């Protein structure tokens, strides 16, 4: 029962073969969830399930540099369900973050921020009960 928003330090940043696992349950009538992999004030990878954008469910991914959001990448596969437990796994690979939800591949997001070893925090926020957040080298 972690408190959201939750900050998970990523010591020495991320690197290929690092697997980040987030376990929680979506609140009833959820509106949003966000993962923010941060390089200081920059957001290297924002992963943002939206449960009601014009009565559609969509995941928005983006990067924030010098306080400016870039060009969004959108995924209409939407594996989250209000009220239900989920597992998000983010595997860092050489060219992208690779995301699986509930053991099914979801999307990849190419690295825009190049200094992976400076992406040293993960913020987890939004309409969830957060059970755990951790990493391991695989
Ligand atoms: O791009 C991800 C980013 O989206 C914004 S909402 C976004 O704001 C821009 C201007 O900054 C446009 O107005 C666009 O139509 C849309 O409203 C926000 O949700 C942020 O947390 C992040 O998800
Ligand atoms: Cl960079």
Swiss-Prot record:
Phosphoserine, modified sites: 76
Domain Galectin per the UniProt entry, residue ranges: 6-136
Tissue specificity as recorded in UniProt: A major expression is found in the colonic epithelium. It is also abundant in the activated macrophages. Expressed in fetal membranes.
Localization per record: Cytoplasm; Nucleus; Secreted
Location (main, coarse): cytoplasm
Keywords for the protein's UniProt record, in alphabetical order: Acetylation, Cytoplasm, Differentiation, Disulfide bond, IgE-binding protein, Immunity, Innate immunity, Lectin, mRNA processing, mRNA splicing, Nucleus, Phosphoprotein, Repeat, Secreted, Spliceosome
Superkingdom field: Eukaryota
Span(s) of short sequence motif Nuclear export signal: 114-129
GO CC terms in record: cell surface; collagen-containing extracellular matrix; cytoplasm; cytosol; extracellular exosome; extracellular region; extracellular space; ficolin-1-rich granule membrane
Gene Ontology MF term list: carbohydrate binding; chemoattractant activity; disaccharide binding; IgE binding; laminin binding; molecular condensate scaffold activity; protein phosphatase binding; protein phosphatase inhibitor activity
Any one biological process term the GO annotation gives: negative regulation of extrinsic apoptotic signaling pathway
Binding-site residues for a beta-D-galactoside, renumbered to this chain: 69-75
Assembly and binders: Probably forms homo- or heterodimers. Interacts with DMBT1. Interacts with CD6 and ALCAM. Forms a complex with the ITGA3, ITGB1 and CSPG4. Interacts with LGALS3BP, LYPD3, ZFTRAF1 and UACA. Interacts with TRIM16; this interaction mediates autophagy of damage endomembranes. Interacts with cargo receptor TMED10; the interaction mediates the translocation from the cytoplasm into the ERGIC (endoplasmic reticulum-Golgi intermediate compartment) and thereby secretion.
Function comment: Galactose-specific lectin which binds IgE. May mediate with the alpha-3, beta-1 integrin the stimulation by CSPG4 of endothelial cells migration. Together with DMBT1, required for terminal differentiation of columnar epithelial cells during early embryogenesis. In the nucleus: acts as a pre-mRNA splicing factor. Involved in acute inflammatory responses including neutrophil activation and adhesion, chemoattraction of monocytes macrophages, opsonization of apoptotic neutrophils, and activation of mast cells.
Record-given protein name: Galectin-3
Species annotation: Homo sapiens (Human)
Species lineage: Eukaryota, Metazoa, Chordata, Craniata, Vertebrata
